[PDB]
Amino acid sequence: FNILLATDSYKVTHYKQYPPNTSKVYSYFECREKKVKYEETVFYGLQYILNKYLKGKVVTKEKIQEAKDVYKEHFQDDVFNEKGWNYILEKYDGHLPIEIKAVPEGFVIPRGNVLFTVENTDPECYWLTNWIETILVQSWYPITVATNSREQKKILAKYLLETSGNLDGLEYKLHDFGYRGVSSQETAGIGASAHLVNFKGTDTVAGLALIKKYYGTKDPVPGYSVPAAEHSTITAWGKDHEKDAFEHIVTQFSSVPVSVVSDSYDIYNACEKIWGEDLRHLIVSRSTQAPLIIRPDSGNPLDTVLKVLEILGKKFPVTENSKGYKLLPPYLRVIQGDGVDINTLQEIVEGMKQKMWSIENIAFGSGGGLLQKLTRDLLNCSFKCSYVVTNGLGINVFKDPVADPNKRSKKGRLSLHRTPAGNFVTLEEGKGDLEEYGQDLLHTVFKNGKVTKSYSFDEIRKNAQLNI
Amino acid sequence: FNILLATDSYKVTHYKQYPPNTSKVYSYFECREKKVKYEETVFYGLQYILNKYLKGKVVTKEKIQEAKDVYKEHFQDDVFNEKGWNYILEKYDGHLPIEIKAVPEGFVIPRGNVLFTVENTDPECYWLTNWIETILVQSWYPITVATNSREQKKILAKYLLETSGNLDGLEYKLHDFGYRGVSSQETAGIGASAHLVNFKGTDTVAGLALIKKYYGTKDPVPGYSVPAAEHSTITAWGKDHEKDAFEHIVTQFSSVPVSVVSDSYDIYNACEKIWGEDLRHLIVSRSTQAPLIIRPDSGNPLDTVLKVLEILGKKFPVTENSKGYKLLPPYLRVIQGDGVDINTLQEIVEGMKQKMWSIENIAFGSGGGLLQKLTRDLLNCSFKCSYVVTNGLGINVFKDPVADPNKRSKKGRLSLHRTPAGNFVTLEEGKGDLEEYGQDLLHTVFKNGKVTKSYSFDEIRKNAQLNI
Numbered sequence A, B: 001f002n003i004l005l006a007t008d009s010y011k012v013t014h015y016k017q018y019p020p021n022t023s024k025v026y027s028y029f030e031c032r033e034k035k036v037k038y039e040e041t042v043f044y045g046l047q048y049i050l051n052k053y054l055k056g057k058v059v060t061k062e063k064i065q066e067a068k069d070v071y072k073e074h075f076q077d078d079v080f081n082e083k084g085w086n087y088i089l090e091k092y093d094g095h096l097p098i099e100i101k102a103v104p105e106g107f108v109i110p111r112g113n114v115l116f117t118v119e120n121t122d123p124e125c126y127w128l129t130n131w132i133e134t135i136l137v138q139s140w141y142p143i144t145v146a147t148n149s150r151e152q153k154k155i156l157a158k159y160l161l162e163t164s165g166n167l168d169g170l171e172y173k174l175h176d177f178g179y180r181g182v183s184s185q186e187t188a189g190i191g192a193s194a195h196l197v198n199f200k201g202t203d204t205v206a207g208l209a210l211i212k213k214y215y216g217t218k219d220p221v222p223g224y225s226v227p228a229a230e231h232s233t234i235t236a237w238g239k240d241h242e243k244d245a246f247e248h249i250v251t252q253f254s255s256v257p258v259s260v261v262s263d264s265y266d267i268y269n270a271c272e273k274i275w276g277e278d279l280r281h282l283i284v285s286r287s288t289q290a291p292l293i294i295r296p297d298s299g300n301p302l303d304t305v306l307k308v309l310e311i312l313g314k315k316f317p318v319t320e321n322s323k324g325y326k327l328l329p330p331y332l333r334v335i336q337g338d339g340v341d342i343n344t345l346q347e348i349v350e351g352m353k354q355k356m357w358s359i360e361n362i363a364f365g366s367g368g369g370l371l372q373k374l375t376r377d378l379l380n381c382s383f384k385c386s387y388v389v390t391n392g393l394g395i396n397v398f399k400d401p402v403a404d405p406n407k408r409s410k411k412g413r414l415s416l417h418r419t420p421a422g423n424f425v426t427l428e429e430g431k432g433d434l435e436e437y438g439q440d441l442l443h444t445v446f447k448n449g450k451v452t453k454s455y456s457f458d459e460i461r462k463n464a465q466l467n468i
């Protein structure tokens, strides 16, 4: 990895564009307001970026020469700031003279607030603040995964509490199926780690090693899975032998939970005749700690869940819980793992509630909806210069495009505070210095090539908890 | 990287679910037909995956032990196939006994056709075929980027040819702005490389080194950029000094093209009064090889482009080209880099055509729309087992879910052929062996830990050309 080649091309040319006599460039990141509405965001992911990409000796003579050679051909011109990068090499042994202050990871902050700020610590490196905008703005992705996952946890929490009276099992109710559906191995790990801020069930193994290496947990692992079938392990038996596949798999996994995809040919037949009759004797014998989890994987998601439950409720003994909602026997559950995103999740649990089914009966799996079907504009994650020093005077700078007030940016030196009512406010124009609003909640997390404050994954999970 | 830890968790448990005495599992990848329709796909990106993740000694003693320890805790049980992985280590020095056949990279193939196949070459490793599904299915991402980019090139080619009579400059008409808007550094490189299959303009630097390392070009680099401003380099001068910023930047870059974002405060004032009056003498003096490129970045994309052009056409000498379309002087161009995706791209060029503006006048930048706002379900990229051998007998296998005939999969051993009319057909059930359709177009690209056939980036670009 070469940080000199990890920026937007045009940023290579910006050192010639700032005002002369500029000694400081100060920039901030927010999830900009736009006036499920995503009113508050989980701040998560910067610590990964700091350690993987920004800390330590990130400049070498070889990296300078490599960048110089690439850019000469890429621009067909000599515009690369070799002098400025060699300065950092010789002066700071290749450590970035940058200070980053950030809200603690896991903090849940309303839209439109400063979440981190970046500035250069040496006047010669005024150009460096926005060089690393591109790498830092990629924090949008773990922020947005963690936020969208938590918003799904809010939906699940509400309907589970309403239909059952408690939140038992909530942390396993949204399973990460997204490994194949994301754009890269690296995205898999980052996105899966952001989901585990809120939940404990994952098949995206990549997230485990990321958390261990960059954040840490008291527990051996941050997330868990169960054995489960795929269409290959069912269909390989032949169409006429689906029952034999089911019987073999539940017997191989007789003492742990086992998920069995049941829609290879006819999900409703599988539920009513194969599970509900031919193999019923292998299901009602199972432990409460080792249920069969029937997995549909096609059709209209709500219609299929509802029909599957109706089928199973006629072949297995249903109870009515203390809230009036129907409950399958404890050895039998369902996981809907197709078509799940935050919108269909809500439709399904509302539809179950209207048909008097407890959310205890169901868990969800989500892949592309959870980790890939997300963009930087969902929360308007954005990085802008708000303050410069030129000729020794600080000036508050901003954009304010005539045709879109939503893209107006903040002015001056910024700080994040609690309000008297316990909410959040970002103070602009250095007004945090007046000390009317208590302590700035941004802390220095990076300075001159060293990570200066770190959070464990356990702390992040605590910070990101739901009120309830 | 540890490929033992680079699969969906549940696949760790599948070796215990296949039929006993299974010696062969054979699977295939397609962009499934679903009933911009995306009727044909660019096959690109498998060679990256083969070289970075699958080739060579990918199993070691340490990797087996690492995976054993992680899965013990992740499943809270001993289901990991330590013996099977030890077999590969001991028998093949950690090389995967897998054979992959694939259509040549860059090939443009209609939906619903086999693009690559995977099978084990040792009967003990029947479970390995679908272990590596997860990593191989991530090829959906370079396929989809390349396809969606090529579809945008088709739109630009149509309207450029109608409004100018040629395709001059086509390969620079859609510039990759997506580095900050993707989910990771790895995704940035893969996605930018996929865009460079069709175009030459990019600010996602990460794409260059990926191509150099994994594909290769005769030219020094596969893509190019120009100097350009951002809001920080304009607003740092102060709101009242926007003119001074503009003058400085165009004078710093007097003899190469320079793009200057012009909407910090009022795009229309910047065009009409700052560029169109105050600084006009610095624009009309510029060379045809070094235009000013004015960049709006906010507002309704079509409305803003049309109003910017109308303004500029009243302040600068417009000609009428041989097709009857209006054309700015050669020292002045526009780039629309906000809100561009395949849908708005079409809207803008059609709206320009209706107002008699040549597409010569404009280029587009696209970031999230080009590299991030894409999912595996756009082309229904999918990997399924179609053939197994069990007790020495091959059987053709498939899924066929009752509620969604679109998820029906192909049966048996597959091959890809030219039809008598020169189209493509996928033959199922081993019928390619009949030789009624000539030779299979798939080539073995990986066998027993080695890449056996490969393509330069130059060949890929040739294969992906538009008909025109």
Ligand SMILES: O=C(O)c1ccc[n+]([C@@H]2O[C@H](COP(=O)([O-])O)[C@@H](O)[C@H]2O)c1
Pocket: A176, A177, A178, A179, A180, A181, A203, A228, A229, A259, A297, A337, A338, A339, A340, A365, A366, A367, A368, A369, B008, B010, B376, B377
């Ligand atoms: O069942 C599992 O343990 C499992 C783990 C990973 C993926 N899957 C399946 O993979 C598919 C991913 O699709 P998607 O659209 O959510 O990206 C979906 O059918 C899931 O049920 C299933």
Ligand SMILES: O=C(O)c1ccc[n+]([C@@H]2O[C@H](COP(=O)([O-])O)[C@@H](O)[C@H]2O)c1
Pocket: A008, A009, A010, A376, A377, B176, B177, B178, B180, B181, B203, B228, B229, B259, B295, B297, B337, B338, B339, B340, B365, B366, B367, B368, B369
């Ligand atoms: O002008 C450039 O060279 C340039 C290079 C990289 C990114 N950008 C800008 O960054 C923004 C990317 O936003 P998006 O939503 O397309 O991902 C958009 O306003 C672009 O104009 C601009």
Ligand SMILES: [Cl-]
Pocket: A229, A230, A231, A261
């Ligand atoms: Cl599956």
Ligand SMILES: [Cl-]
Pocket: B229, B230, B231, B261
């Ligand atoms: Cl910009």
